[PDB]
Design a protein around this ligand. Structure first.
Ligand code: ADP
Ligand code: ADP
Lengths: 557, 557, 140
């Protein structure tokens, strides 16, 4: 018997975040509660502590994802709980989930098992209203664009080249492509546009790479909404919108102090797209936790090929962060799959598969290697992984020359994470990390993409469509050449072939389109149509969700 | 002499709401803070005081609106504050403003001068996120309708008969008329629709008319979104959205405790339109106040002919309230506009036009009479009124059997309302009310409409277009005939012609359209052209809005 | 376009054949160079006005009707080909042809003079037929 995630977080025992705020030496006029159990820590905290030295930066990443599931949050949070069970002054920084999944597929634990962050309900509903403000700032900008068209279009924008869309945090496919502006001289200018899920907002992206508020304000100002008739780009700043957008963000820029079932301080702040964007919680939440703990467990989206890579290449580069360790997660199950084992064959023990599957992990370790960062494999263990496999895998990481550990934080709490914690410590004490950015700003865009594609995915090279080259020609020329590179591609493989599992070689990566996030300050190579607006299943969670007289919720998890 | 509104909202010391909370007999386990100066109060409070007697209910209303501004919210707060001075246990209930105005037309205070509920900024912006919840629940329903189409359209909704629009709390004209569902079979069902500003949402109206959560859930279920190809209604019940929507409103349902400049406790909750909806703050807020205090002041959008009338015929009806008194706000200024005087020369004394305009106010007093509620006029003092004009206003007011007070609450705060406060108290001590609604629900839709039109508006009779006659017959045959009537008409005339100021005679009203709010529980006849989505001006306030590092806001107020 | 008109009417009249409007391959045609018509949304205005859907126009000579005119052996053959024309698919993916909407006789009738070749001549009075005019890329 293990009870369900929800029953767990429910029977759990939360501590007023005000005391946790206290225990980290957050002043009480810097806390801003939302009930006894969530709060916004003013930015003033960091800026009074900007010199006190940063704790030690630990990134949790993982192997390329699989239907089997890796448990990268579970084990990013469990490690956190072990490090507190060892009297380390440690936090965990995490991403806020979109609201949308809650009502479609289902709501999920900020982690899972005995490695959750709480309160789980609030995290999955409106929480502190973070995403409501993004949405509202994005759409106020769009509002202002369409209105600017209505008022005579002084800036001579071609309505048909407007890249600025709209957001809503519901999986609504009906809004993917729409026409707005209908009904005459009074109601605007008809045009084609659409809606993406709000977490994919560039505004969401900025939230997460803004340094202070005035950085968010100015990033806003840089955003490309669309181009004039002569091809000249127009910005949020041209529309003199950056003010009001910043204003709508005033409270959302502040990170949200929650906690674990084991009362370790957690930040939850930001939650951007991991493909068309960098995949991390905000910089604010990390740079703050850094001045507040001696250890900061944090994480990034997908496998290490995308999350970690960008974590280093965009976030760390921006923030001046110098990560220290990095855990890479894995299962004998997720690895059996990378050895041509269909999801039904995860039942039978399979010593032979686990060997070839390993190729995925080894590749990652090398790639983490490539940053001057001390890896550590962590192994999320599963109820039917017979010990045959475990040691066989255990072997292969050491046989591949990097540290390895069993992780039982799912089933056992901070206790199951002690082993791994210790190695992270062994590593933190004895293994310094000369982190370097995998590339240089001044490289041409293609050079940059080559690097990542060649060095990280392990490809023989990159190929570029007619439009893709045309677009890069446009941007280098507009000056947007300096920026980093965010790699819009599948996650389920090192390649773009969503089915090329393991370490496929001989392949090349093909770049179909190239979008700009001037505001976030990056550039997005696309290697496959990107799902920016999911739709609801045949029967949405919504249909089965309910709340009674007592406030009892069913169907949410 | 008197500072600005924003200057005032920052100077005055706010008391931790938890105190105000306790001061009212609200247990700690019933208050959830949103910082120090905001709180949601539990619905458990009303339940634990179900059997205490109600304080006195006092409605603040006004003569016919002009573009000049009228005096209402400011009197509500000002009256409240004077009563607290006079020693009385008093609360004021107010509506939450939409986010929209803040960026286009203008963000003004919840009141003004020294008669303001605060914290200003938070009330005007995201507040405690109620409107966001309303927004998101309404659009989740929308999303669910379209998904229904896409998933085989089992309920057989004719997309084209869909009445459920979408909402956003921005002034976005371009969204009024849209076509969605485009892109292929993968992307939903192409159809026409649009957005309304969030506070026009039936969800908002249900929030404001609900008795608690399970009632709000029920109303939700009764919401009609569209019709089968056969003309049979399809409700949100039918798509099983009520639990989700409810769940999304679980914090939105509790009223928000806040306060005036003088720390008088104050509820802000709900915020509907006064034309397609009843334009009152919530029943939950009002009905709790009546338990926690001996005097509750609340108010209604637009003029007495609209807000007051709907306050009595809808709100009080749903709730079994009985107004003990009612204040009508008049200004010498506007009463002259009603006597012909254009906006440009309102400062010039003109007793004859003032005598003519009084007709407007006279008609309103008569109308409050018809509900059994003793009236008291409040003259909102302006520096350019002459003593002669004021005295003439008191003459007519008494010659019309109404007590009247001058009210300098905008400048002097609670003190400028003592004379009024005392007159109100004199009326309560000596003229106990005989409250009754204007009309019985038995009457047909056309009878109920006639009775309002003739008794209240002073209309001769009422006309219909063929479309209105079809709707009324549809609504009747579908059994919504015994519903209350909410008249969307212009606010600036008793007539349905916005130019016909003063006390128009020999006129007819025309009902062009009839929509239905089955969840809110009423029928909406439309007379003019009704704007359920304002749009941005030439140079929107959002362009002039900034915030710097010090947190200092400019061009927002 | 009569066929087109008949497809949409089919939708409006209760959509008995259960065409998914969105899978409709039968566009409309006009023998003008009109770019603005390539991508359109039709069927708007209310239940009185048809079924909103995406579609567009092709220049008339690209029309399959033109191609059938040019490949037909006579009228009854042109009628048959017509009937076999696929306009779209049921929600189930099964094809719905012009046969299914019973348009082939009408279309045929509309082509009763169109079917005969047109005799004319060269500058030197050598006899000359002009008849048919399809695209050489999507058609022959
Ligand atoms: N060891 C385990 N056994 C069973 N279920 C697990 C285990 N670890 C994680 N899970 C569940 O599966 C999901 C995957 O873990 P999570 O950390 O959320 O994945 P990721 O962060 O890689 O998306 C979690 O929601 C959790 O409930
Ligand atoms: N006596 C007065 N002198 C100056 N300004 C006033 C006075 N009374 C009201 N106002 C202003 O009018 C504005 C809008 O009118 P308000 O007082 O809210 O009345 P209403 O609710 O009828 O619109 C407020 O922001 C307030 O500052």
């Amino acid at each position: 018997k293990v009870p369900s995630d929800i029953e767990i977080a429910q029977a759990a025992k939360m501590k007023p975040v005000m005391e946790l705020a206290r225990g980290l030496g957050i002043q009480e006029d810097e806390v801003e509660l939302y009930g006894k159990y969530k709060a916004k820590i003013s930015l003033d905290v960091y800026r009074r502590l900007k010199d006190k030295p940063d704790g030690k930066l630990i990134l949790v990443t993982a192997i390329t994802p699989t239907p089997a599931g890796e448990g990268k949050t579970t084990t990013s949070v469990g490690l956190t709980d072990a490090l507190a069970r060892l009297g380390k002054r440690v936090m965990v920084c995490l991403r806020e989930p979109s609201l949308g999944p809650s009502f479609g597929i289902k709501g999920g634990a900020a982690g899972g098992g005995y490695a959750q962050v709480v309160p789980m309900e609030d995290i999955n509903l409106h929480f502190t209203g973070d995403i409501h403000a993004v949405t509202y700032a994005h759409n106020l900008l769009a509002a202002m664009v369409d209105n600017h068209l209505q008022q005579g279009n002084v800036l001579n924008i071609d309505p048909r080249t407007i890249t600025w869309r709209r957001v809503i945090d519901l999986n609504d496919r009906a809004l993917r492509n729409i026409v707005i502006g209908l009904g005459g001289k009074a109601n605007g200018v008809p045009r084609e546009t659409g809606f993406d899920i709000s977490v994919a907002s560039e505004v969401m992206a900025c939230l997460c790479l803004a340094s202070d508020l005035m950085d968010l304000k100015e990033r806003f100002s840089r955003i490309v909404v669309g181009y004039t008739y002569d091809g000249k780009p127009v910005t949020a700043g041209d529309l003199e919108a950056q003010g009001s957008m910043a204003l709508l963000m005033k409270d959302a820029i502040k990170p949200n102090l929650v906690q674990t079932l084991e009362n370790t301080p957690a930040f939850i702040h930001g939650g951007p797209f991991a493909n068309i964007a960098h995949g991390c919680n905000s910089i604010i939440a990390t740079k703050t936790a850094l001045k507040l703990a001696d250890y900061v467990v944090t994480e990034a989206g997908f496998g290490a090929d995308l999350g970690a890579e960008k974590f280093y290449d965009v976030k760390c580069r921006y923030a001046g962060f110098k990560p220290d360790a990095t855990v890479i997660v894995a299962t004998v199950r997720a690895l059996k799959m990378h050895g041509g084992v269909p999801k039904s064959d995860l039942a039978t023990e399979n010593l032979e598969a686990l060997r070839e599957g390993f190729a995925n992990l080894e590749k990652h370790i090398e790639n983490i290697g490539k940053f001057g960062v001390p890896a550590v494999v962590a192994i999320n263990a599963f109820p039917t992984d017979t010990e045959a496999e475990l040691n066989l895998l255990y072997e292969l990481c050491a046989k591949a020359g990097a540290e390895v550990a069993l992780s039982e934080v799912w089933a056992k709490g901070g206790e199951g994470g002690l082993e791994l914690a210790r190695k992270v410590l062994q590593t933190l004490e004895s293994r310094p990390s000369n982190f370097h950015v995998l590339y240089n700003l001044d490289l041409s865009i293609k050079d940059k993409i080559a690097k990542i594609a060649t060095e990280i995915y392990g490809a023989d090279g990159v190929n570029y469509t007619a439009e893709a080259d045309k677009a890069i020609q446009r941007y280098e020329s507009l000056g947007y050449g300096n920026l980093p590179v965010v790699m819009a591609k599948t996650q389920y493989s090192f390649s773009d072939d969503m089915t090329k599992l393991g370490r496929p070689r001989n392949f090349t990566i093909t770049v179909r389109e190239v979008r700009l996030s001037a505001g976030a300050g990056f550039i997005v190579p696309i290697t496959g149509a990107i799902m920016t607006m999911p739709g609801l299943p045949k029967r949405p969670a919504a249909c089965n969700i309910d709340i009674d007289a007592d406030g009892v919720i069913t169907g949410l998890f």
